[PDB]
Design a protein around this ligand. Structure first.
Ligand SMILES: [Mg+2]
Lengths: 146, 94, 39, 193
C-alpha cells in the first residue's frame, strides 16, 4: 500500500505484445531470421520497460517513502523501484544472451514459476563473476604497483 | 604525399565533427590527425608526434574510459603510470 | 608538478609516495568496469 | 531518361529516408549503451549483457552504412520487396518489410535469374549505389623463448592469486566464491594476451 503499481501498465503490455505478434508473423512468413527476430523483440521490450519506468515515476507522489529514499541519493535507483512495482523485464540465458520472453510481473504482483526459473541463471552467473572481477582488479593493481 | 589506401570497408570513417558527417574530401588534416574511427597506435604517435602527444593520448583515452563507467579519478594519477613508460631509449646510434 | 595531495587539499609533502596511491586509486574501482566475458 | 531520372531521384529519396532512420537508431542505441555503461541501476551481469548486446547492435548498424540497399524485386503481384544488407521494418505499420536481409528466405529471389522462370518476380533492379547514392537502373526480367615466456606469465598470475586474501583470512559475511577456485593462473594468463 506504499509500493504502488501504475495503472497505465496493462495497456502498454498488450500493445507491445501485439507488436511482438506482428514480428512472430514476419518470422513465420519467411520474411526474417531467428536472431534478428529476437533482437527486434528485445528492442520492443526495452522500450516498454522504459515507458513503464517513466509512467511509474510520473504517478508516484512526491512524499512516498521509497521515492524519497531514492531521490535524496541515499539508496537505490529507479530500476530497482521499477522492478519492484513495474516489471522486472528481460533477463539472460546462461550464455549472456537475452530472452524474448520477458518478466511481465513484479516482486509485488508476484512472480510466476517460469518467470522465476529464468531469473536464477543471471543470479548465479553474477555471484560467480564477482570473484573473477576481483581477481582481474588485483592483477591490474599489482602490476601498476610493480 | 602520403597514402593509406588499405582501408577496410568495415570501419566507416572519421566523423568530420565540423559545426557531423563522414570525413569529407579536400579537407584540412594536421600531422596528429586520425582517418578512421577507432584507436591509434601509441608507437605510431611517438614516431610521428613525439613524447608529448602520445602521453596526452594515453591519459585522455584511459580517463575517458574510466569516465564512461561511473568513476571519478584525477589525471595526476594516470600521468604517474605514464612517466614510467618513456624513461628508456632504444639506441640506434651509439 | 604533482600539485596538492587530494587527501589534504594543500601542497604535497616531500618524501611522500605517489606512485602507489595512483595504482590503488585506479585498481580500487576496477571492479566497477566491463571486463571481457569468461565462457 | 526523364522517367529514369524521376525514378532514380525517388529511389534516392527513399534510400536517404532509410539512412536517416538508420542514423536515428544509431544515436538511440549509442545513448542507451552509454547510459547502461555508466550506471544501469542493476547489477553487473545484466549491465555487461546489455552492453555487449547494444555493441552488437551498433556494429550491425554501421557495417551497412555504405551500400545498404542492394536492389529491388518488384513482383508480378503488383507488389515490391526491396533488399539490402540489413533488416528494416516500420514498427508502426505492422512491421511492413521495407528492407529484407540478403539472407532471408523471402529474399532468395535476388539471385535466381532464368529464361522466364520466375517465382513471382517480374522486374528486378540491381542498383549501382556507390556508398550512399543510387546511380544505375539494371533491369533483369624458435620454440625456446615461448616456453619461458608462458611459464613466467603463469608464475605472475599465480602470484596475483596468492596475493589476494584467502578463506582462512576473510572478514566477510559468509564464505563466498573467490578467484582461487573459478579460474587458474594459466587461464588468467591466456586472457591477457
Ligand atoms: Mg557483508
Amino acid at each position: 500500500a506504499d509500493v504502488l503499481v501504475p495503472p497505465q501498465k496493462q495497456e502498454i503490455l498488450e500493445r507491445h505484445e501485439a507488436e511482438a505478434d506482428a514480428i512472430e508473423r514476419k518470422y513465420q512468413r519467411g520474411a526474417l531470421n531467428h536472431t534478428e527476430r529476437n533482437e527486434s523483440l528485445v528492442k520492443i521490450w526495452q522500450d516498454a520497460t522504459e515507458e513503464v519506468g517513466k509512467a511509474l515515476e510520473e504517478f508516484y507522489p512526491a512524499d512516498n517513502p521509497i521515492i524519497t529514499i531514492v531521490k535524496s541519493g541515499a539508496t537505490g535507483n529507479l530500476t530497482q523501484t521499477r522492478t519492484l512495482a513495474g516489471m522486472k523485464g528481460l533477463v539472460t540465458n546462461p550464455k549472456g544472451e537475452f530472452i524474448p520472453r520477458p518478466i511481465k510481473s513484479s516482486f509485488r504482483e508476484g512472480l510466476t514459476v517460469l518467470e522465476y526459473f529464468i531469473n536464477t541463471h543471471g543470479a548465479r552467473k553474477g555471484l560467480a563473476d564477482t570473484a573473477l572481477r576481483t581477481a582481474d582488479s588485483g592483477y591490474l593493481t599489482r602490476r601498476l604497483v610493480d | 604525399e602520403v597514402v593509406y589506401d588499405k582501408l577496410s570497408k568495415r570501419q566507416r570513417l572519421r566523423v568530420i565533427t565540423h559545426e557531423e558527417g563522414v570525413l569529407s574530401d579536400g579537407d584540412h588534416v594536421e600531422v596528429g590527425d586520425q582517418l578512421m574511427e577507432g584507436a591509434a597506435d601509441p608507437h605510431e604517435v611517438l614516431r610521428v608526434q613525439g613524447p608529448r602527444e602520445v602521453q596526452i593520448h594515453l591519459v585522455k583515452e584511459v580517463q575517458e574510459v574510466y569516465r564512461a563507467q561511473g568513476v571519478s579519478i584525477h589525471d595526476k594519477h594516470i600521468e604517474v603510470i605514464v612517466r614510467q613508460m618513456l624513461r628508456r631509449v632504444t639506441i640506434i646510434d651509439s | 608538478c604533482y600539485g596538492r595531495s587530494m587527501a589534504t587539499g594543500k601542497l604535497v609533502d616531500i618524501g611522500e609516495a605517489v606512485g602507489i596511491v595512483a595504482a590503488q586509486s585506479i585498481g580500487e574501482p576496477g571492479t566497477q568496469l566491463t571486463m571481457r566475458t569468461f565462457h | 531518361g526523364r522517367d529514369y531520372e524521376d525514378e532514380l531521384q525517388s529511389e534516392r529519396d527513399y534510400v536517404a529516408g532509410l539512412y536517416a532512420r538508420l542514423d536515428a537508431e544509431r544515436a538511440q542505441s549509442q545513448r542507451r549503451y552509454a547510459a547502461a555503461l555508466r550506471e544501469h541501476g542493476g547489477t553487473a551481469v545484466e549491465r555487461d549483457a546489455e552492453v555487449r548486446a547494444l555493441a552488437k547492435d551498433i556494429a550491425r548498424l554501421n557495417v551497412a552504412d555504405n551500400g545498404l540497399c542492394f536492389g529491388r524485386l518488384d513482383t508480378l503481384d503488383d507488389a515490391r520487396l526491396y533488399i539490402g544488407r540489413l533488416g528494416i521494418f516500420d514498427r508502426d505499420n505492422d512491421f511492413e518489410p521495407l528492407l529484407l536481409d540478403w539472407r532471408a528466405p523471402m529474399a532468395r529471389p535476388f539471385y535466381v535469374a532464368t529464361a522466364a522462370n520466375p517465382e513471382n518476380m517480374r522486374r528486378r533492379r540491381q542498383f549501382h549505389t556507390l556508398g550512399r547514392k543510387v546511380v544505375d537502373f539494371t533491369d533483369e526480367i624458435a620454440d625456446e623463448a615461448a616456453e619461458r615466456e608462458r611459464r613466467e606469465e603463469e608464475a605472475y598470475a599465480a602470484g596475483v592469486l596468492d596475493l589476494m586474501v584467502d578463506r582462512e583470512d576473510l572478514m566477510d559475511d559468509e564464505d563466498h566464491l573467490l578467484a582461487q577456485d573459478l579460474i587458474d593462473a594459466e587461464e588468467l594468463a591466456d586472457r591477457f594476451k
